[PDB]
Amino acid sequence: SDKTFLENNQYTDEGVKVYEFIFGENYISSGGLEATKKILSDIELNENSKVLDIGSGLGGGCMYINEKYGAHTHGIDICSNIVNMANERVSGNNKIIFEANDILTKEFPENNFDLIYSRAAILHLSLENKNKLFQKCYKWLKPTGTLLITDYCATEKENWDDEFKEYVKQRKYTLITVEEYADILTACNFKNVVSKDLSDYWNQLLEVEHKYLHENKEEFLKLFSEKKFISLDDGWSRKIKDSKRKMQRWGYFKATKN
Ligand SMILES: Nc1ncnc2c1ncn2[C@@H]1O[C@H](CSCC[C@H](N)C(=O)O)[C@@H](O)[C@H]1O
Ligand SMILES: C[N+](C)(C)CCOP(=O)(O)O
């Protein structure tokens, strides 16, 4: 249902390929590899670490984490077609696993992971399900483990304008404030909760991506259609405008179990 909605609309094969063109090979979220390097710059792991990636997409994050640290990485994604694409991009590596499943019904042992990592995925979850997920994450982390998240956030709903309301409604996102998000983590008894509103950084990423799209329009049109170009172009224009005024926000969260 949730699964069917995502597979048949935002994350159709063609939809993901369009996103990948602008985000970067193996990525479906902003900044691609370069942002991932920054997000993980203060994370310490090694070959004995176990990592969970919630909403693993095309697998770029898992590929990088395994490359940088040698860690065991397990990616969960609800879209079967996306997981199929991810599995075609990795071979001969028994420390990278991609699995098609709803994270809300997936079972993991308590005290299992050194790092639980998620990039631009939890926006798809209802508010009730965000709280349920972070309770599960708390159990699944080792005592010494870390939670690391980036996600779409927003200003308070009361402040949304007509265009943003419509965007959120059609995407079926649940966008909360950075502050409400941090409060959920605190309510789940995570420790050392750090939240950052990185909307300015995100704005910079979006501008680079927008410039890339325009400068490679001929290549894009060979691959796709002008209709899809216009949708992407207008989509990024709106996100640049709405991130600048913090109507749509980009949140970073890090916390520990103890
Ligand atoms: N309930 C759920 N369980 C697992 N994955 C989910 C989910 N709801 C949404 N997703 C996944 O979240 C992903 C968002 S796209 C982001 C992919 C990757 N983290 C990257 O940054 O590139 C989608 O692939 C979608 O399938
Ligand atoms: C949400 N996402 C960052 C995974 C994909 C892009 O979504 P959108 O920016 O087109 O709404």
Q: What is the CATH number of the domain that holds 63?
A: 3.40.50.150
Domain containing residue 173:
1-258
Backbone angles phi, psi at 61, to 5 degrees: -60, -45
Q: How far apart are CA 100 and CA 55, in angstroms?
A: 10
Taking alpha carbons only, the member of 239, 127, 118, 115 closest to residue 177 is 127
Task: Give the active site residues.
Answer: 11, 124
Rounded CA-CA distance 41/163 in Å is 36
DSSP character at residue 167: H
Instruction: Provide the terminal-to-terminal Cα distance of the chain, rounded to the nearest Å.
Output: 36
Q: How far apart are CA 133 and CA 161, in angstroms?
A: 29
Q: Which residues are CB-neighbours of 107 under 8 A, at least 6 positions away?
A: none
88 DSSP β-pair partners: none
Q: Which ligand is nearest to the CA of 164?
A: 2
Hey, what are 220's tokens? 């894009």
Please answer whether residues 108 and 51 qualify as being in contact, where contact means their C-beta atoms are separated by less than 8 angstroms. no
Are the C-beta atoms of 26 and 60 separated by less than 8 Å?
yes
Name beta bridge partners: 100: 77
User: Hey, what amino acid is at 18?
Assistant: V
- The domain total for the chain is 1
Strand positions, DSSP E, the chain = 50-54, 72-77, 96-100, 113-119, 141-154, 191-197, 248-256
Structure tokens given for 188: 């789940």
b/e for 90-118, b at 16 or more Cβ within 10 A? beeeebbbbebeebeeeebeeeebbbbbb
In the reported structure, the alpha carbon of residue 6 is separated from the centroid of ligand 1 by a whole-number distance in angstroms of 9
Instruction: List pocket residues of ligand 1, CB cut-off 6 Å.
Output: 6, 11, 27-29, 55-57, 60-61, 76-79, 82, 102-104, 119-121, 124
Q: Which residues line ligand 2 (CB under 6 A)?
A: 19, 28-29, 120, 171, 235, 239
Token pair listed for 9: 């609309």
Residue 247 burial (CB count, 10 A): 19
Task: Please tell me the distance between residue 209's alpha carbon and the centre of ligand 1 in angstroms.
Answer: 20
Data resolution in angstroms: 1.6
Please tell me the distance from the alpha carbon of residue 151 to that of residue 46, in angstroms, as a whole number: 25
